[PDB]
Amino acid sequence: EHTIFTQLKKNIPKTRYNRDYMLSMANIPERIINVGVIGPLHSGKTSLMDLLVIDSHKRIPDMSKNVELGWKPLRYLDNLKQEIDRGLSIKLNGSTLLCTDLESKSRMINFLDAPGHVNFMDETAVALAASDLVLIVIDVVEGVTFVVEQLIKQSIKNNVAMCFVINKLDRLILDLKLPPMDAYLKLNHIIANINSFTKGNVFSPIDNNIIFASTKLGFTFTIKEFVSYYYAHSIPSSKIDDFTTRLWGSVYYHKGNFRTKPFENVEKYPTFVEFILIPLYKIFSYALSMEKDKLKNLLRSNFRVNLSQEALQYDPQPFLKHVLQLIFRQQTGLVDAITRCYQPFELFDNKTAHLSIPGKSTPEGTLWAHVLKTVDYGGAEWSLVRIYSGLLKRGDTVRILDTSQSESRQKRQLHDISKTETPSCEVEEIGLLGGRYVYPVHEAHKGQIVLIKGISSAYIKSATLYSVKSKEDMKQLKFFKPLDYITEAVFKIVLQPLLPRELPKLLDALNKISKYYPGVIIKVEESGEHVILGNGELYMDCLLYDLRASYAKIEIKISDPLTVFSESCSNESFASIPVSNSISVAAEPMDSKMIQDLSRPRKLSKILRTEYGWDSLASRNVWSFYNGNVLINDTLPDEISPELLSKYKEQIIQGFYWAVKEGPLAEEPIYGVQYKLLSISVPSDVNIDVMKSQIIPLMKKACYVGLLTAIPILLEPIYEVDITVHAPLLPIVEELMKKRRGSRIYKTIKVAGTPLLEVRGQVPVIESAGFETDLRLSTNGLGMCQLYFWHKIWRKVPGDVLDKDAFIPKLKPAPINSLSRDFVMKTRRRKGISTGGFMSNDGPTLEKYISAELY
Amino acid sequence: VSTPELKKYMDKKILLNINGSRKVAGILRGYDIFLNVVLDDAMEINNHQLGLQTVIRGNSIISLEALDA
Amino acid sequence: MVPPINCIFNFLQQQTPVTIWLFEQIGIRIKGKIVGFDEFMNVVIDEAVEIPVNSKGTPLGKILLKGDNITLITS
Amino acid sequence: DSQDDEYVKDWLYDSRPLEEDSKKVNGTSYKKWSFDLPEMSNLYRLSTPLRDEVTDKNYYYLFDKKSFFNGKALNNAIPGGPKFEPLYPREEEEDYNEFNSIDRVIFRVPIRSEYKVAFPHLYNSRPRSVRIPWYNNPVSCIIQNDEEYDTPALFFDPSLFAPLLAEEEEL
Amino acid sequence: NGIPVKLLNEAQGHIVSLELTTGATYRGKLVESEDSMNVQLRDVIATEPQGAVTHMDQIFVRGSQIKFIVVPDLLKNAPLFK
RNA sequence: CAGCUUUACAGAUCAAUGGCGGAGGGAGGUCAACAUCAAGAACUGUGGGCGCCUAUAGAACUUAUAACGAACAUGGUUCUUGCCUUUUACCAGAACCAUCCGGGUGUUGUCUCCAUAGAAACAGGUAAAGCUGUAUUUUUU
Numbered sequence A: 001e002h003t004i005f006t007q008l009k010k011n012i013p014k015t016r017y018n019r020d021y022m023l024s025m026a027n028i029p030e031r032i033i034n035v036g037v038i039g040p041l042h043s044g045k046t047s048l049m050d051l052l053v054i055d056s057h058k059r060i061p062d063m064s065k066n067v068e069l070g071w072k073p074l075r076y077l078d079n080l081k082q083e084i085d086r087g088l089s090i091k092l093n094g095s096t097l098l099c100t101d102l103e104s105k106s107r108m109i110n111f112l113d114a115p116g117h118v119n120f121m122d123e124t125a126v127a128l129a130a131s132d133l134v135l136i137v138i139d140v141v142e143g144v145t146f147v148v149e150q151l152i153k154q155s156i157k158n159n160v161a162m163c164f165v166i167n168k169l170d171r172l173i174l175d176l177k178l179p180p181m182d183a184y185l186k187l188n189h190i191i192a193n194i195n196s197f198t199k200g201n202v203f204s205p206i207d208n209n210i211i212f213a214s215t216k217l218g219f220t221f222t223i224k225e226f227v228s229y230y231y232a233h234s235i236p237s238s239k240i241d242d243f244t245t246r247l248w249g250s251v252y253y254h255k256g257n258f259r260t261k262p263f264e265n266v267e268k269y270p271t272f273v274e275f276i277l278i279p280l281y282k283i284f285s286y287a288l289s290m291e292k293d294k295l296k297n298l299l300r301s302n303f304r305v306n307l308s309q310e311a312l313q314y315d316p317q318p319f320l321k322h323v324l325q326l327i328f329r330q331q332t333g334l335v336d337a338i339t340r341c342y343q344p345f346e347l348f349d350n351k352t353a354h355l356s357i358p359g360k361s362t363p364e365g366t367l368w369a370h371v372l373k374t375v376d377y378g379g380a381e382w383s384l385v386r387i388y389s390g391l392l393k394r395g396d397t398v399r400i401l402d403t404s405q406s407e408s409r410q411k412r413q414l415h416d417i418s419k420t421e422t423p424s425c426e427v428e429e430i431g432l433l434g435g436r437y438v439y440p441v442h443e444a445h446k447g448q449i450v451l452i453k454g455i456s457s458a459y460i461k462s463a464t465l466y467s468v469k470s471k472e473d474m475k476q477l478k479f480f481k482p483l484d485y486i487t488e489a490v491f492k493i494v495l496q497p498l499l500p501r502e503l504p505k506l507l508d509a510l511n512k513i514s515k516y517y518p519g520v521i522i523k524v525e526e527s528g529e530h531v532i533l534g535n536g537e538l539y540m541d542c543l544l545y546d547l548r549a550s551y552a553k554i555e556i557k558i559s560d561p562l563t564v565f566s567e568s569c570s571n572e573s574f575a576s577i578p579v580s581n582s583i584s585v586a587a588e589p590m591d592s593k594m595i596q597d598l599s600r601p602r603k604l605s606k607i608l609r610t611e612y613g614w615d616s617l618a619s620r621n622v623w624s625f626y627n628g629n630v631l632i633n634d635t636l637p638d639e640i641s642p643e644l645l646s647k648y649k650e651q652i653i654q655g656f657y658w659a660v661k662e663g664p665l666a667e668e669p670i671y672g673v674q675y676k677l678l679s680i681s682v683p684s685d686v687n688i689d690v691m692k693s694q695i696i697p698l699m700k701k702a703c704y705v706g707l708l709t710a711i712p713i714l715l716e717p718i719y720e721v722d723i724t725v726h727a728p729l730l731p732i733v734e735e736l737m738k739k740r741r742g743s744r745i746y747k748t749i750k751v752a753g754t755p756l757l758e759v760r761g762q763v764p765v766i767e768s769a770g771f772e773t774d775l776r777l778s779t780n781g782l783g784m785c786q787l788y789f790w791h792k793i794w795r796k797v798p799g800d801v802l803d804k805d806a807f808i809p810k811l812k813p814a815p816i817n818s819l820s821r822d823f824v825m826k827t828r829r830r831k832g833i834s835t836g837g838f839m840s841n842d843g844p845t846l847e848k849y850i851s852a853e854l855y
Numbered sequence B: 001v002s003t004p005e006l007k008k009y010m011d012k013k014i015l016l017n018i019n020g021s022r023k024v025a026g027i028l029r030g031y032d033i034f035l036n037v038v039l040d041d042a043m044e045i046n047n048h049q050l051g052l053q054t055v056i057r058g059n060s061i062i063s064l065e066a067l068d069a
Numbered sequence C: 001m002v003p004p005i006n007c008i009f010n011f012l013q014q015q016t017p018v019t020i021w022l023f024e025q026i027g028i029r030i031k032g033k034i035v036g037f038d039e040f041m042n043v044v045i046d047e048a049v050e051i052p053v054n055s056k057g058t059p060l061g062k063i064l065l066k067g068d069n070i071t072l073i074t075s
Numbered sequence D: 001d002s003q004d005d006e007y008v009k010d011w012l013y014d015s016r017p018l019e020e021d022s023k024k025v026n027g028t029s030y031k032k033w034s035f036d037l038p039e040m041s042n043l044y045r046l047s048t049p050l051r052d053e054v055t056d057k058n059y060y061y062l063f064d065k066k067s068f069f070n071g072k073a074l075n076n077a078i079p080g081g082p083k084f085e086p087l088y089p090r091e092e093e094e095d096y097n098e099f100n101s102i103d104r105v106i107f108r109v110p111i112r113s114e115y116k117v118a119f120p121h122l123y124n125s126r127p128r129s130v131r132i133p134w135y136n137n138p139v140s141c142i143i144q145n146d147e148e149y150d151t152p153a154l155f156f157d158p159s160l161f162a163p164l165l166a167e168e169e170e171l
Numbered sequence E: 001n002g003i004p005v006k007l008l009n010e011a012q013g014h015i016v017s018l019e020l021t022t023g024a025t026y027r028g029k030l031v032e033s034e035d036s037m038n039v040q041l042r043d044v045i046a047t048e049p050q051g052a053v054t055h056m057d058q059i060f061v062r063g064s065q066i067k068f069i070v071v072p073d074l075l076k077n078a079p080l081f082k
Numbered sequence F: 001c002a003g004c005u006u007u008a009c010a011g012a013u014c015a016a017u018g019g020c021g022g023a024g025g026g027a028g029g030u031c032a033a034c035a036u037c038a039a040g041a042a043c044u045g046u047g048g049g050c051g052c053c054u055a056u057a058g059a060a061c062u063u064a065u066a067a068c069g070a071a072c073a074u075g076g077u078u079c080u081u082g083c084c085u086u087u088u089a090c091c092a093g094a095a096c097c098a099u100c101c102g103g104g105u106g107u108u109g110u111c112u113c114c115a116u117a118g119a120a121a122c123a124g125g126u127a128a129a130g131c132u133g134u135a136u137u138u139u140u141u
């Protein structure tokens, strides 16, 4: 019992603060900030986390000499071979640390290091879900890209407190070599952009929200922090807050001990530029350039930090790094800023409501905890669980739900408004994060995040867990929803294993992948063709590696990568036709705005409809949409108001659900439709169940018919396409874009203070296929593209489906109109609907398609 | 230097335990960095109200225990 | 929010029946009309009246009661 | 000239070479060398004619040794890169199955060789002994040979008690 | 700045005990503390100087009138002092 | 401008106790001989020196990765190309051993420059070096 624990403790890096204290703190909530460090690709959030880790610990095991010197990063939370070999932090491989503040109020923080790269929004999403605060991190230079804006938007929704980290100041000092004034201007611009992206809150260096950082060198400061270190000496305590306030913005300070008049005389350089940025610049120059002795003297005088004898014999980048670490101390400022940001706990309730419906909690009688993500921290599986309320002890006998079954549960509860516990679990070991170890603990508590070893057998992906002791408690309980994995998947990898003897193994691995990588729809289709919707290419590759090395360990084939296509109409329907073995339906494509709204109480609904698409009152009355796909169902005949046969809709819509799930043409889901009932020819003899069953087929058929009528189409998706190219290489990029079929430049934005042209675009996900690689080869190591699908924007595959003339070449890519059909046919073939090397598509029923639509 | 965080107690009735083993009641209307209290009036603890609104000095306050949760 | 200074100012503007309590002195109270204002709680209060508390009235002129020994105000 | 390369010209061209008798080396055994900045800078400048290696790590996208290895062990190439014997036996015999038919897949992307090494595990099926390549960030830089220093040259322009070093320095 | 103040701040969350000038001990979760020991506490019992005890919800106390504060013995360990 | 330690000291008594060790050099050299080599060193063992350093040796796990060496040539067996046929000699790719060419680390010696006490402090004084420092509601008017 104890011996094992001791052993575990031993196999671990000894922390500078006592872990006992941290544990004690964790027993109390409000002393636990859960922080998602998040940002764009290569923000240097992982690096930042590394710095924090370093600060925490005395000596790390695999911290090499080079890394110590400050050459390579030691991305302490990169962990698994995949990530260190690849360059990208890939999974949410976080850490827990006590951190003192300016005014040393310790607080046990549960950092979770997101992945930047856009095809891992899954992990980012998870982090967001977990973490009540989020350190957004930004490259100075790359600026507030669209990705960052998106993140901000989808952190307001969650919701969360948004500290920012303007990371990579070194880049503007040394790479861009901006003057100090210019740098300041750039920073201001960035701040403005951030504010714009935000709705409610204003962010600035004052009020502790911006955290200026350069993790390469490894300094973070906030302005308050700076003041504490280096401007208590020279000012009386009472006027320190005021000074801090002055520091940011359009403010100047002339020779006057101690005023500080806003504006102004002769030589400019503002307060921020004079008292911060300029100082930093000087430090940099001196660190690199100056006679070392003089620098040392300066640092004795102006900072009271001593360049050691061993440190003096360093090389520049290392020396500079050392200097900056000496200056701005083990990063307390950041922690302070974080603390300031997190309200706290006004937000928290709201966040929890968002996660799992509004209501009221129950502290003593039960515990509940969001099982957020399965992981593979210490080889074996754990569930990264956040305990929201109660305290979850080791060995405890526990309830659970995969949030596939959450909505259903809620519905059941509502209906209710015996004691059946559907699954269960025995909590083997509970631990903390992180990076390169799992500190084990007997008790998990309300507030804090943990890894839990007993959980995994029951759940897949999102999950809740609970431990009630009543009926009342059960009633009170709610269930976290599945996490809006902001990106969504779009990218098919169709698997065969090479030796189909070893399909079981693959299946086992596949389940693991599903669990472990949570942004992956694994469809196992009827033919034997397994299918994997990745977010994108890199993510997919990573997943493959994980499967094809660790979890499966088998030789495994792969297809040229495809998409999902979804069904939609262009024009409206024309003639309803009820089928027998008796109901008829017809669909119009809904307004684009409405669709967009959907992508992002009856009277209320009606009002909303009116606001959106100018729907009448009758239309409002009729509505009943479904699936979050989306398609919209409308009960809009005449007799329906008299009829109670059209009433009992709850039964009727089952067919609709099915239809939406798998459309006619693709056998692949419908999208962007307003379905409308026209007639429901129900006979006199009921047999209610039988009737219901009939409806369940018939409705689908009706829907299909409607789709056919309305001039249907496959909808391909479009990747929104960030490209951060070098200015004079934009023509090349344009050419590249032109070269392929779907491709469009929606704007070319100038990233201020850089040579970068942030050119947002759109590209369809079958046209994507390695596009990043193409971009990077062509552009000669410039223009780090990204592709992503935050929006859920689809488009017309350009042409008319249902044409046997179609195309010429089997082997080649087909022309655009032709392609409109070709994809559909191929999809059908894949599904196993058409039978043969050559075939066609047509819709029954009936009467020979009404005599070929009356010729 | 810092403001007394009594924004939770704003517009709620409070038992102001005051100097010399005395008491005051009343709904909280305002305060400052010295912990003076401005409150819409109530009784001195059987019982008898004086005033429409009242102001208690900072020094005088032992405690301000919340009557409402 | 209505700060204490603001309240005091308002009272001054009004000229209303103010009843002051003494710090660490139960038995006595003051009753008058606020005339002055200071950075501290100190004020001048013309037409004041000393009161023995109910466990009547007593004669008293114009007075400034010092801010340190104030307790209650009402106006 | 005495102006530009002042710190080297007295020693640069000598047997050992020089900087041989000083604090700037271990000694005559000549195993460990140390330098100040200006001399180093001068040396670098002198070199530039010879060793202009463009060290934007991204420049070498698919020209890193790992990438080359991958290419080798995929029997794949890059117009500029090298080519080898195929490292495993080239034994395809696909047999156009239910999966990977002509009428099942959609040949929309050309799927060039370039891609196959850049994403070893996706585009290439059966990647035996293929190392995971990098994926880095983009470079913003300015390298010049002019008189003035620390200015915006070719960027895009934005929209709109002494502080602790105050004339100790000019920046 | 005062290290006792820091300690008090740290003790936030924890169940502190707290006597005043009057001699009226309290014991409760420390909600908030300031530089001047202006303590707030939750779920707090209140002993009279004579003997009798009274439960109460969210007490505020002004540090001026506070005498001494007992903090839990865990805070002895870390991480304020060094 | 106050205090404490740390050196130079004056002349102490002189304990006293500390510290200083009862004294053993610091450099380098295309000087050697000897081991031991990715750094790791976790965790254990067993030493000195106090829930912990410093040495050792033992595997674990690390990633090696890019670089004991920002270096790269050559052998051999086997397997596979290919010259082809045969000998060398090779083409061009694998696997496992080996070969040089270089490399550090400490152990020691030896050879040329730089050094240099045989003790010092207590009680404070002198000189310098290092850290801590204004009453009107919450601390001490």
Ligand SMILES: Nc1nc2c(ncn2[C@@H]2O[C@H](COP(=O)(O)OP(=O)(O)OP(=O)(O)O)[C@@H](O)[C@H]2O)c(=O)[nH]1
Pocket (backbone or CB within 6 Å): A040, A041, A042, A043, A044, A045, A046, A047, A048, A073, A075, A087, A088, A089, A090, A114, A115, A116, A117, A167, A168, A169, A170, A171, A175, A213, A214, A215, A216, A217, D137
């Ligand atoms: N010049 C400069 N380079 C930096 C700075 N911070 C990080 N980098 C470098 O740019 C890269 C970014 O750091 P990473 O830690 O890899 O970024 P990350 O947070 O892991 O990004 P994800 O893997 O997407 O989360 C690394 O190669 C760093 O060495 C900086 O402040 N200045």
